[PDB]
Amino acid sequence: VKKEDELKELRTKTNEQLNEEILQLKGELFMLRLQRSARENFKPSDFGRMRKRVARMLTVKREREIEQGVGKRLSRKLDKAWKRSIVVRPPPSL
């Protein structure tokens, strides 16, 4: 599962990662709270999954752009511009 993750998502390409990232940090973060999801139905590893999932995602966008150039000044700027244009919507399982 761990060693697979590069072989998984280094294949999916940037504009695929947007909706992947957002769907990850959407539901299985947010929807699992609310009442802590059905009171005996946390599966608290899910918080362990998504937190580590999205962090592995965001590296790939970042670590790719180092090879191109960018260098953390432009990166922060385009993170604002991207982050500025989002619109939350119902996650999967709803």
Site for RNA, rule CB under 7 A:
1-3, 42-45, 48, 59, 62-63, 66, 70-77, 79-80
9 vs 26, which CB is nearer to other proteins? 26
Tokens, residue 26: 């959407």
In the complex, least distance from residue 82 CB atom to other proteins, rounded to whole angstroms: 11
Q: Contact 86/22 with Cβ under 8 angstroms? A: yes
All residues at 6 or more sequence positions from 49 whose CB lies less than 8 Å from its CB, including other chains: 28
Site string for other proteins, 11-50 (x = CB under 8 A): -----------x--xx--xx--xxx-xxx-----------
Interface residue with other proteins, options 44, 84, 92, 93 (CB under 8 A) = 84
Which residue, chain included where needed, has tokens 């695929």?
16
Burial 53-91 (b: 16+ CB within 10 A, else e): bbeebeebeeeebeeeeeeeeeeeeeeeeeeeeeeeeeb
Q: Is 55 in the site for other proteins (CB under 8 A)?
A: no
Number of amino acids touching other proteins (CB under 8 A): 19
